Design an enzyme around this catalytic site. Structure first.
Site, PDB file in Angstrom:
ATOM      1  N   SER A   8       0.795  -1.241   0.000  1.00 44.62           N
ATOM      2  CA  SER A   8       0.000   0.000   0.000  1.00 44.62           C
ATOM      3  C   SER A   8       0.825   1.289   0.000  1.00 44.62           C
ATOM      4  CB  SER A   8      -1.033   0.041   1.130  1.00 44.62           C
ATOM      5  OG  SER A   8      -2.109  -0.835   0.842  1.00 44.62           O
ATOM      6  N   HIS A  21       0.139   5.539   4.715  1.00 47.73           N
ATOM      7  CA  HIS A  21      -0.358   5.795   3.360  1.00 47.73           C
ATOM      8  C   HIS A  21       0.039   7.194   2.861  1.00 47.73           C
ATOM      9  CE1 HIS A  21      -3.663   2.504   3.966  1.00 47.73           C
ATOM     10  NE2 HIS A  21      -2.495   1.989   3.621  1.00 47.73           N
TER      11      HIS A  21
END
Ligand SMILES: *C(=O)C[C@@H](NC(=O)OC1CCCC1)c1ccccc1
Ligand SMILES: O=C1C[C@@H](c2ccccc2)N1C(=O)OC1CCCC1
Ligand SMILES: [Cl-]
Ligand SMILES: [Cl-]
EC number: 3.4.21.105
Length: 180
Positions: free
Chosen positions: A111, A164
């Site tokens: 991610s 993220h």
């Protein structure tokens, strides 16, 4: 028509590791591949990167590899393998760092890397159309929907918003540098 060597080898590696996790359970694979979770492990240097190879569900791996295949694949084809390697190494390191800092060392997945790639391809196209690299309108929309999913925890994920963001920051930074 084929994904480049880095794009391809990363997908294979993720799949092999996902298999290892089914045969041995997640914990045992994490024992070997996770970010150093004990000071006696701090010099096992593969750990600063190999966390990116672990996925914890079908969705996780299917979606990460899909975006990796498309964004990573385009970057590799148009900008070269070297470029993809560096984006990957830096984003994996920084998003892993931020993740362990806020939430400890038990996490994994591409991610951080796909956030970087997403940020990279988007900003590059915004600032430098003639580059040939850009993120289509429809893909900007789908990327945004998944960012929302992760931001508001609509779908449970391994990494937190901070990691993220750290991944995205890397991609934006490199696109910015590249479009000077
Ligand atoms: C990583 O954040 C896991 C999620 N992948 C993701 O959100 O990527 C989007 C696509 C472009 C960057 C943001 C994830 C998605 C679906 C299922 C599980 C995990
Ligand atoms: O993420 C993404 C991009 C979009 C998509 C579009 C076409 C094929 C595959 C994926 N997407 C996604 O979440 O799409 C969902 C709606 C239909 C397939 C799953
Ligand atoms: Cl392919
Ligand atoms: Cl995640």
């Amino acid at each position: 028509e084929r994904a480049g060597p880095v794009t391809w080898v990363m997908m294979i590696a993720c799949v092999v590791v996902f298999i290892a996790m089914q045969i041995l359970g997640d914990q045992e694979v994490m024992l070997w591949l996770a970010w150093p979770f004990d000071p006696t492990l701090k010099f096992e240097f593969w750990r600063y990167f190999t966390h990116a190879l672990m996925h914890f569900s079908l969705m996780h791996i299917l979606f990460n590899l899909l975006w990796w295949w498309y964004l990573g694949g385009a970057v590799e084809k148009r900008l070269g393998s070297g470029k993809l390697i560096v984006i990957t190494l830096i984003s994996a390191l920084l998003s892993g760092y931020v993740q362990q800092k806020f939430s400890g060392p038990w996490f994994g997945g591409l991610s951080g890397v796909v956030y970087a790639l997403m940020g990279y391809v988007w900003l590059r196209g915004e600032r430098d159309p003639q580059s040939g690299i850009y993120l289509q309108r429809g893909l900007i929309i789908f990327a945004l929907i998944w960012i929302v999913a992760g931001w508001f925890d609509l779908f449970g994920m391994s990494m937190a918003n901070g990691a993220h963001i750290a991944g995205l920051a890397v991609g934006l930074a490199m696109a910015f540098v590249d479009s000077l």
